[PDB]
Amino acid sequence: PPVIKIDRPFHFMIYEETSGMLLFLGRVVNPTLL
Amino acid sequence: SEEEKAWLMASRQQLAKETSNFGFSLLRKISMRHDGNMVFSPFGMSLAMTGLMLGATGPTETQIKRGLHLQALKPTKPGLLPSLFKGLRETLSRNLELGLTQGSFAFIHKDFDVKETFFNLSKRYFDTECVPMNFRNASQAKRLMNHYINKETRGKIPKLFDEINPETKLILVDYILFKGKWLTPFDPVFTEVDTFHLDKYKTIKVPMMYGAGKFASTFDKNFRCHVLKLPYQGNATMLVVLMEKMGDHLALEDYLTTDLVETWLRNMKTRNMEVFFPKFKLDQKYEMHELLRQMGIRRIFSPFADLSELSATGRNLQVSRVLQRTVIEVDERGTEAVAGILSEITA
Ligand SMILES: [Ca+2]
Ligand code: NA
Ligand code: NA
């Protein structure tokens, strides 16, 4: 079974799909701090 | 009537697309001065700048619209843009499964006379709650505003305000609160500390969640990045973009556009797979005064600012400060994210 392993820095976007409105946008380079 | 609905729908699609592009432009600017974790709300920023536009007029207002990538939005009607956020707010408020609420405050200095037409339009479009406030009593003003914002963010932003400029005449504050539940939750039993690579040399150990199920994903051969959809209930989703390679590689922020995002969505495939995704908690705040000037929004921050839709008498007002603060928590059940955006108006 395929795997995606998010074990390194990533970007994220939270979208509302009907409007296509981008609610939140960011990057995590280190998930143990703020 | 059917044609008005189609047209209002096309206008709303345009607003969303342009707000996404505004967001990517802003991320790029933020990343010039910040090398760590980042988060903010493109939607919240545009909604906040649109709130300000009710107070602004002439070139001051038009430059704001250009800055938001909203130049030649398909119609040229009075109140069109705020009416779009209003319409969008009423529909998003109806999907109860979405878990998205928003609101608006106007904190007004007790001696500062404001045009009723401003109150009327703000209430009409943003359901703004007006709270008179003595800004020459710094600590009282700070406590009252912080209580209000604390309540509406459910304690996720306890102290949006610290320093109070005693020349403040009005502070507009917009908040967005999103509580999403994953469509496929992570079972907390399987969450264990695992290796996360900070760069090519350093690793750290982080709480890593396990998910199994059908998930939509795709690999962009060009950037060498995996893009993964993590859907919530009520037709929202988190897109995660993961570069395989760490090193001298490409700054994704320099190429992030709606065209690119749509290319990824167009090429998604669904299949049973396992997802390992870390828990995280961010809390980021940015003064936007200077970044926004870097996107060409300038006059509103100058002594040429025309905010005469605001004052019952006399516009010698300007925006001294625009601050956003955003918190996000990701865990096995879902995502909770809250954004509070303030614009301070001074004499
Ligand atoms: Ca009215
Ligand atoms: Na201009
Ligand atoms: Na980057």
What is the DSSP annotation of B186-228? Answer: PPGGG-EEEEEESSSS-EEEEEEEEEEEEEEEEEETTTTEEEE
Compute the nearest-CA separation of A23 from chain B (Å): 5
Q: How far apart (Å, rounded) are the C-alpha atoms in residues B46 and B32?
A: 21
Q: How far apart (Å, rounded) are the C-alpha atoms in residues A27 and B189?
A: 27
- State the DSSP H helix or E strand holding residue B243, giving kind and residue range, or none if neither: strand B236-243
> Does the fold of domain B183-278 match that of domain B1-182+279-347?
no
Search chain A and give the residue with CA nearest B16: A21
Search chain A and give the residue with CA nearest B284: A34
Nearest ligand to the CA of B242 is 3
CATH code for the domain of A8:
2.10.310.10
- Phi/psi region, residue B235 (left: phi>0; alpha: psi -120 to 50; beta: rest), is left
Beta-carbon separation of B42 and A25 below 8 A: yes
For an interface test with A, the pick among B9, B13, B39 (most A C-beta atoms closer than 10 Å) comes out as B39
Compute the nearest-CA separation of B144 from chain A (Å): 26
Q: How far apart (Å, rounded) are the C-alpha atoms in residues B93 and B101?
A: 7
- Contacts (Cβ under 8 Å, ≥6 apart) of B109: B132, B133, B134, B135, B168, B169, B170
Contact B130, B324 (CB under 8 A): no
DSSP B135: T
Boundaries of every domain in chain B:
1-182+279-347, 183-278
Residue B178 forms contact with A (CB below 8 Å): yes
* Chain A environment of B271 (Cβ under 8 Å): 2
Strand order in the sheet with B280-287: B129-133, B100-109, B168-181, B334-346, B318-330, B280-287
Kindly report the backbone phi and psi dihedral angles of residue B217, in degrees, each rounded to the nearest multiple of 5, phi listed first. -150, 170
Architecture of domain B1-182+279-347: 2-Layer Sandwich (3.30)
Q: Resolution in angstroms for this experimental structure?
A: 2.1
CB pairs < 8 Å spanning A and B:
171
Nearest by CB to A31, from B19, B271, B279: name it.
Answer: B279
Alpha carbon of B93 to ligand 1 centroid (Å):
21
Contacts of the segment B46-49: beta carbons below 8 A, 24+ positions apart: B46/B15, B46/B19, B46/B22, B46/B70, B46/B85, B47/B85, B47/B102, B47/B126, B47/B174, B47/B176, B47/B341, B48/B172, B48/B174, B48/B322, B48/B324, B48/B341, B48/B342, B48/B343, B49/B297
As a whole number of angstroms, the longest Cα–Cα distance in chain B is 64
The experimental technique behind this entry is: X-ray
- Contacts (Cβ under 8 Å, ≥6 apart) of B55: B118, B170, B307, B309, B310, B345
Q: A13 - beta bridge partners?
A: A25, B239
Structural domains counted in chain A = 1
- State the DSSP H helix or E strand holding residue B3, giving kind and residue range, or none if neither: helix B2-33
* CATH of the domain spanning B183-278: 2.30.39.10
> Which domain, by its residues, includes A6?
1-34
Kindly report the backbone phi and psi dihedral angles of residue B111, in degrees, each rounded to the nearest multiple of 5, phi listed first. -105, 0
Contact B337, B329 (CB under 8 A): yes
Contact B284, B303 (CB under 8 A): no
Beta-carbon separation of B91 and A12 below 8 A: no
